[PDB]
């Protein structure tokens, strides 16, 4: 019904431009959906899907090809606005959700979702686009201030991470069991790990050729603590084990051959404070204390 | 007397209505109540008290025979038995027993 | 006032409050619209045709002919259809989940074969007293549809050894287990199947021949909830102690009719048991000495079952009656060593107890039968 | 905490916000509670009139199988009924659809086709030649 749809679209377009209109209107838009449905809503679902697709397509001609530290602002701001307005639109379309979609899926049938999941899929196809490689590259370049930097604006990175966790597969397989970090892993974590490995390999080689082994252990422990803490301000719970294993395999377990000689030289001239650091570092490894235990 | 209660329950049982616990012997279904079989045979209280279901289905081992079984419930209800000399041995326990029945 | 002006959702919500007999006998003859409403996938995906005797023999061709989402087939107590009449429905079986057929003797392993290969999805196979259910079909049941999550195989004396191993190697999603007096069950089929899925909660092996050699190894898993080890062959006491000390999550323990099991277990069960909720001790040879410990040293208890106790202490029972705050579950039966005071005073003293004595539960049963 | 619900034809109904908190007004305040309120403006309900909205707040005030109070409250005309069904579907009052769709099913239950057809003024849009096939299709009782 176009008599409904003209005003319905005129209200949905201002739900998404967050003008914050009163409750006498956002109850008059729910009445349009209710009156239409009880007059089914297949073509209403089609109109909503088309509206969301066109809205994102026109939105995304802006903010593209503004690569470094500027895709971050764009993506975070537009994501929070889109997510809030899509929750509001789902609240409006609750009747279509409860009676048509529920009765229509009811088997696992694909291609028909609730309005919030529909908008999430549309925004994932917004992510399935050049705005998932330069935001990720700029996140990596912003984390790559592991050397120095204090106005890093953690809120730019963490929010991005949040997006990649919300866009886990929503397509009504059977039900949301638990965490759904597939897009998160595939699009951020592999590159994050493969970048930290290279960074720490280069840094370890440079520092060992620049300084002796006695106070390289201090740096290795400090960097391990820093990497442990970084997972709590860019927080996702399931990265600590893998990041720790990468960091231990790169910082230690690759310079063990010089650790043994330094152990012997530390034993000769009794420096009992460095031996504790060495014991901790090599005990972080699995089955690494064998040669130290014989040299002793 | 409570024997009036027992006789009333017996007559209600012998209508296939108000029957709560159902016994199954190679296909035959013998209907009865919930409290009385608990009071009678200690093998039955075992399988009964552990549930609060609606309709119960208790099966008996081949060791218990139907021919002696029908008068067992009758003697549980009205304490009167009918029996001749050919079918005695699989009942000769005089403390009922006949079921497991190590007490 | 027109009822047909209501949206179809409301009419379906109204029609869901009528039984299948009412819906197919009265509401389907009123008019065309009501007949078309009382025919859906809504009303024909939960069949529950139990105990419909000699009326459904070849009819199962029409119940599942255009219906696409039968998931709750229940033909318990069936005595009319044959292998053909169940395999015709088994051919399609789109996403069947909870197949159930108790006491259907005429069914054979052919029905199991038909239902196990035409639906790779299942959740419950609770079959019952069907005899002549040999173990050849359950092999393919575990081989083809490795998605089943719950079995029930009581009173089927043909599941001796192959069945448990075959639905123990492939299938892993099982949650509940129940078994009955099934002979020829060896111990060397559960010890191997004790490390894959530790998420089992209900365990029942009544009247079975499982040796304690597998019960000893139960200390590995620490997620067991309910136990039904009735008439078991000398399970280890220290294993029960360890599972009740470590596994705080424990719901049910029956252990009825066991004679080698001694008084020590129930003496010590009140030392640390706080979340224990019921006890079923029928015809136990208790020495009327653990009552003092179970009343003094236990403060959290709501269900108690006294069975064929030849001896009892009326004073102790009276003391524990008011010792607790909500423990009122005295279902006394055949207690010869009883006085005539409790059954005469506690009936009116505590108007929140039902009791189970013969003198009382004869008028109450008749009254509740007459009212309903 | 006072929504100022206005009826369809116009009558202002102040309520405490636990009395009228149902899944289409409860959801609205969750998604429009972040910003400033609109000076307690009325929230018109264009599909609920002023005689039915009175009973809806009477039923929700008490509740802050078909019990005694709900048996005597649902003692209205069939025309005052069939709109409590629609006004609980419109506002999504999950507990008022249940106790009301049972009542309409309690005068369908066990009454044979004829006086069911008489009770709801259903015109028999049903012939007799095809009645012999519909009574043979449901032969299985």
Phi/psi of residue A125, nearest 5 degrees: -70, -15
Q: Using CA atoms, how far apart are residues C224 and C202, in angstroms rounded to an integer?
A: 7
Q: Please check whether residue D102 is in contact with residue C17, taking contact to mean a CB–CB distance below 8 angstroms.
A: yes
Sign of the four-CA dihedral A28, A30, A36, A39: negative
Specify which residues C211 forms β-bridges with.
C233
B100: tokens are: 């497991």
Question: Which chains form contacts with chain D, at 3 or more CB pairs under 8 Å?
Answer: A, C
Contact C256 B50 (CB under 8 A): yes
Cα angle, residue D58 at apex, residues D52 and D62 outer, rounded to 5°: 150
Query: Does A260 lie at the interface with C, CB-CB under 8 angstroms?
Result: no
Contact D32 A31 (CB under 8 A): no
Q: Using CA atoms, how far apart are residues C277 and C267, in angstroms rounded to an integer?
A: 16
Residue among D10, D104, D108 nearest D53 (CA): D10
Contact B35 C363 (CB under 8 A): no
HSE-up (13 A, CA, CB side) for residue C166: 16
Contacts of residue C81, Cβ cutoff 8 Å, sequence gap at least 6: C56, C57, C58, C60, C75, C106
Q: Using CA atoms, how far apart are residues A215 and A221, in angstroms rounded to an integer?
A: 10
Burial class (CB in 10 A: 0-12, 13-18, 19+), C358: middle
Say whether C23 sits in a helix, a strand or coil.
helix
Q: Which residue does chain C place closest to D88, by CA atoms?
A: C10
Sign of the four-CA dihedral C261, C262, C264, C270: positive
Contact B100 C105 (CB under 8 A): no
- Which residue among B35, B59, B61 places its CB closest to the CB of C361? B35
Q: Using CA atoms, how far apart are residues C180 and D12, in angstroms rounded to an integer?
A: 67
Candidates C5, C7, C8, C9: best to mutate against A (most CBs of A within 10 A) is: C9
Specify which residues D2 forms β-bridges with.
D16
Contact D140 C13 (CB under 8 A): no
Residue among C289, C265, C297, C260 nearest C279 (CA): C265
Chain C residues in contact with D126 by the CB 8 A cut-off are 29-32
Q: Please check whether residue A248 is in contact with residue A285, taking contact to mean a CB–CB distance below 8 angstroms.
A: yes
HSE-up (13 A, CA, CB side) for residue A228: 9
Kindly write down the DSSP assignment for every residue of C104-125, as one continuous string.
-TT--HHHHHHHHHS-S--S--
Chain C residues in contact with A107 by the CB 8 A cut-off are 69, 95
Question: Which chains form contacts with chain B, at 3 or more CB pairs under 8 Å?
Answer: C
Region label for B18, one of left (φ > 0), alpha (ψ between -120 and 50) or beta (otherwise):
left
Radius of gyration of chain A (CA): 27
Strand B21-25 and strand C202-204: the pairing is unpaired
Q: Please check whether residue C331 is in contact with residue B45, taking contact to mean a CB–CB distance below 8 angstroms.
A: no
Q: Using CA atoms, how far apart are residues C197 and C322, in angstroms rounded to an integer?
A: 44
Dihedral angle computed from the Cα positions of residues A89, A91, A93 and A96, in that order, rounded to the nearest 10 degrees: 150
Q: Please check whether residue C99 is in contact with residue C78, taking contact to mean a CB–CB distance below 8 angstroms.
A: no
How close does chain C come to B56, measured CA to CA in Å?
12
Contact D117 C55 (CB under 8 A): no
Kindly write down the DSSP assignment for every residue of C216-272, as one continuous string.
GGGGS-----EEE--S-B---HHHHHHHHHH-----B---TT-SSS-THHHHHHHHH
Displacement of CA A72 from its chain's centroid (Å): 12
Residues in C 43-102 with any Cβ partner in B closer than 8 A: 102
Q: Please check whether residue A95 is in contact with residue A114, taking contact to mean a CB–CB distance below 8 angstroms.
A: no
Q: Using CA atoms, how far apart are residues D106 and D104, in angstroms rounded to an integer?
A: 5
Burial class (CB in 10 A: 0-12, 13-18, 19+), C279: buried
What residue has token string 């529950």? C48
Displacement of CA C275 from its chain's centroid (Å): 22
Q: Using CA atoms, how far apart are residues A214 and C51, in angstroms rounded to an integer?
A: 84
3-state SS, one letter per residue, for D29-93: HHHCCCCCCCCCCCCECCCCCCCHHHHHHHHHHHCCCCCHHHHHHCCCCCCCCCCHHHHHHHCCC
What residue has token string 């099913």? D105
What is the resolution of the experimental data for this entry, in Å? 4.6
Candidates B50, B62, B100, B102: best to mutate against C (most CBs of C within 10 A) is: B50
Contact A107 C9 (CB under 8 A): no
Q: Please check whether residue D52 is in contact with residue D83, taking contact to mean a CB–CB distance below 8 angstroms.
A: yes
Kindly write down the DSSP assignment for every residue of C298-361, as one continuous string.
-------EE-S-S---HHHHHHHHHHSSS-------S--S--SSHHHHHHHH-TT-----TTTT
Instruction: Label residues A121-147 b or e (16+ Cβ within 10 Å = b).
Output: bbbbebbeeebbebbbebbbebbeeee
Contact A38 C69 (CB under 8 A): no
Query: Does A4 lie at the interface with D, CB-CB under 8 angstroms?
Result: no
HSE-up (13 A, CA, CB side) for residue A199: 17
3-state SS, one letter per residue, for chain A: CHHHHHHHHHHHHHHHCCCCCCCCCCCHHHHHHHHHHCCCCHHHHHHHHHHHHHHHHHHCCCCCCCCCCCHHHHHHHHHHHHHHHHHHHHHHCHHHHHHHHHHHHCCCCCCCCCHHHHHHHHHHHHHCCCCCCHHHHHHHHHHCCCCCCCCCCHHHHHHHHHHHHHCCCCCCCCCCCCCCCCHHHHHHHHHHHHHHHHHHHHHHHHHHHHCCCCCHHHHHHHHHHHHHHHHHHCCCCCCHHHHHHHHHHHHCCCCHHHHHHHHHHHHHCCCHHHHHHHHHHHHHCCCCCHHHHHHC
Residue among A23, A91, A7 nearest D6 (CA): A23
Query: Does A25 lie at the interface with D, CB-CB under 8 angstroms?
Result: no
Chain C residues in contact with D121 by the CB 8 A cut-off are 1-2
Specify which residues C202 forms β-bridges with.
C176, C226
How close does chain B come to C366, measured CA to CA in Å?
8
Contacts of residue A133, Cβ cutoff 8 Å, sequence gap at least 6: none
C137: tokens are: 């079909």
Contact A22 D41 (CB under 8 A): yes
Task: Name every residue in B having a CB less than 8 A away from some CB of C.
Answer: 2, 5-6, 8-9, 12, 18, 24, 27, 33, 35, 38-39, 42, 45-46, 49-50, 57, 59, 61, 100, 102-103
Region label for C185, one of left (φ > 0), alpha (ψ between -120 and 50) or beta (otherwise):
beta
How many residues are there in chain D?
A: 141
Displacement of CA C356 from its chain's centroid (Å): 23
What residue has token string 């038995």? B81
Displacement of CA C152 from its chain's centroid (Å): 9
Determine the straight-line distance between the first and last CA of chain A, rounded to whole angstroms: 86
Contacts of residue A21, Cβ cutoff 8 Å, sequence gap at least 6: A14
Specify which residues D6 forms β-bridges with.
D12, D44
Q: Using CA atoms, how far apart are residues A6 and A118, in angstroms rounded to an integer?
A: 21
Q: Using CA atoms, how far apart are residues C282 and C335, in angstroms rounded to an integer?
A: 12
Residue among C110, C108, C102 nearest C132 (CA): C108
HSE-up (13 A, CA, CB side) for residue A87: 14
Radius of gyration of chain C (CA): 26
Q: Please check whether residue D11 is in contact with residue D52, taking contact to mean a CB–CB distance below 8 angstroms.
A: no
What residue has token string 């593209």? A64
What residue has token string 């015809």? C283
């Amino acid at each position: 019904l176009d008599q409904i749809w003209d005003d319905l679209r005129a209200g949905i377009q201002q739900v998404y431009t967050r003008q914050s209109m009163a409750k006498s209107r956002y109850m008059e838009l729910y009445t349009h959906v209710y009156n239409y449905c009880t007059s089914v809503g297949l073509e209403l679902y089609k109109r909503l899907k088309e509206f969301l697709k066109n809205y994102l397509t026109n939105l995304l001609k802006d903010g593209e090809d503004l690569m470094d530290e500027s895709v971050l602002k764009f993506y975070t701001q537009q994501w929070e606005d889109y997510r809030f307005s899509s929750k509001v639109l789902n609240g409006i379309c609750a009747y279509l959700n409860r009676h048509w979609v529920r009765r229509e899926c009811d088997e696992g049938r694909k291609g028909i979702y609730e309005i919030y999941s529909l908008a999430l899929v549309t925004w994932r196809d917004c992510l399935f686009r050049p705005l998932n490689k330069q935001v990720t590259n700029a996140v990596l370049k912003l984390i790559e201030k592991e050397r120095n930097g204090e106005t890093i604006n953690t809120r730019l990175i963490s929010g991005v991470v949040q997006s990649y966790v919300e866009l886990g597969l929503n397509e009504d397989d059977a039900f949301a069991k638990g965490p759904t970090l597939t897009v998160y892993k595939e699009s951020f974590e592999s590159q994050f790990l493969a970048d930290t490995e290279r960074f720490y390999t280069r840094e370890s080689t440079e520092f060992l050729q620049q300084n002796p082994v006695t106070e390289y252990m201090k740096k290795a422990e400090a960097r391990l603590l820093e990497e442990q803490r970084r997972v709590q301000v860019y927080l996702h719970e399931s990265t600590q084990d893998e990041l720790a294993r990468k960091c231990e395999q790169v910082l230690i377990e690759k310079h063990l051959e010089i650790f043994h000689t330094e152990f012997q030289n530390l034993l000769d001239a009794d420096k009992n404070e460095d031996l504790g650091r060495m014991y901790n570092l090599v005990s972080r490894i699995q089955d690494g204390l064998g040669e130290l235990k014989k040299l002793l | 007397h409570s024997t009036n209660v027992l006789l009333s329950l017996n007559d209600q049982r012998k209508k296939d209505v108000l029957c709560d616990v159902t016994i199954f012997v190679e296909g035959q279904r013998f209907r009865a109540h919930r409290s009385v079989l608990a009071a009678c045979s200690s093998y039955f209280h075992s399988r009964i008290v552990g549930q609060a279901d609606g309709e119960l289905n208790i099966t008996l081992p081949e060791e218990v025979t139907v021919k002696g079984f029908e008068p067992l419930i009758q003697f549980a209800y009205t304490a009167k038995l009918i029996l001749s000399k050919e079918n005695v041995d699989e009942v000769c326990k005089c403390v009922e027993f006949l079921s497991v029945h190590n007490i | 006032p027109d009822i047909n002006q209501l949206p179809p959702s409301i009419l379906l919500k109204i029609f869901s409050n009528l039984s299948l007999d009412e819906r197919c006998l009265s509401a389907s003859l009123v008019c065309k619209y009501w007949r078309d409403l009382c025919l859906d996938f809504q009303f024909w995906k939960q069949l529950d045709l139990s105990s419909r005797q000699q009326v459904t023999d070849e009819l199962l061709e029409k119940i599942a002919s255009r219906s696409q989402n039968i998931i709750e087939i229940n033909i318990s107590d069936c005595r009319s259809m044959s292998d053909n009449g169940v395999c015709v429905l088994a051919f399609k079986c789109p996403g069947l989940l909870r197949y159930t057929a108790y006491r259907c003797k005429q069914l054979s392993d052919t029905s199991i074969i038909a239902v196990a290969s035409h639906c790779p999805l299942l959740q419950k196979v609770h079959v019952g007293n069907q005899d002549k259910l040999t173990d050849e079909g359950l092999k393919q049941l575990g081989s083809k549809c490795r998605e089943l999550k719950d079995i029930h195989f009581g009173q089927c004396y043909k599941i001796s050894d192959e069945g448990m191993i075959v639905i123990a190697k492939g299938c892993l999603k099982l949650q509940r287990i129940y078994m009955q007096e099934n002979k020829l069950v060896t111990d060397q089929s559960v010890k191997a199947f004790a490390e894959h899925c530790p998420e089992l909660q209900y365990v029942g092996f009544m009247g079975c021949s499982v040796t304690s050699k597998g019960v000893i190894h139960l200390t590995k898993l620490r997620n067991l909830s309910s136990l039904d080890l009735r008439h078991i062959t000398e399970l280890d006491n220290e294993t029960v102690m360890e599972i009740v000390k470590r596994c705080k999550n424990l719901s049910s323990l029956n252990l009825c009719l066991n004679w080698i099991i001694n008084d020590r277990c129930v003496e010590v069960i009140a030392k640390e048991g706080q979340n224990l909720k019921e006890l079923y001790l029928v015809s136990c040879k208790i020495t009327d000495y653990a009552l003092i410990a179970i009343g003094r040293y236990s403060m959290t208890i709501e269900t108690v079952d006294v069975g064929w106790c030849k001896e009892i202490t009326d004073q102790g029972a009276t003391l524990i009656a008011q010792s607790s705050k909500s423990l009122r579950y005295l279902g006394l039966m055949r207690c010869d060593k009883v006085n005539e005071v409790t059954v005469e005073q506690l009936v009116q003293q505590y108007p929140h107890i039902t009791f189970s004595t013969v003198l009382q539960d004869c008028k109450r049963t008749l009254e509740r039968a007459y009212q309903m | 905490p006072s929504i100022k619900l206005q009826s369809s034809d116009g009558e202002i109904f102040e309520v405490d916000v636990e009395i009228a908190k149902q899944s289409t007004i409860k959801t609205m305040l969750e998604d429009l509670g972040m910003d400033d309120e609109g000076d307690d403006d009325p929230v018109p309900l264009p599909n609920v009139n002023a005689a039915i909205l009175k009973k809806v707040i009477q039923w929700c005030t008490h509740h802050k199988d078909i019990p005694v109070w709900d048996q005597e409250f649902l003692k209205v005309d069939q025309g005052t009924l069939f709109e409590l069904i629609l006004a609980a579907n419109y506002l999504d009052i999950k507990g008022l659809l249940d106790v009301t769709c049972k009542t309409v099913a309690n005068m369908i239950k066990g009454k044979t086709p004829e006086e069911i057809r008489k009770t709801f003024n259903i015109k028999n849009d049903f012939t007799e030649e095809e009645e012999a096939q519909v009574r043979k299709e449901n032969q299985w009782c």
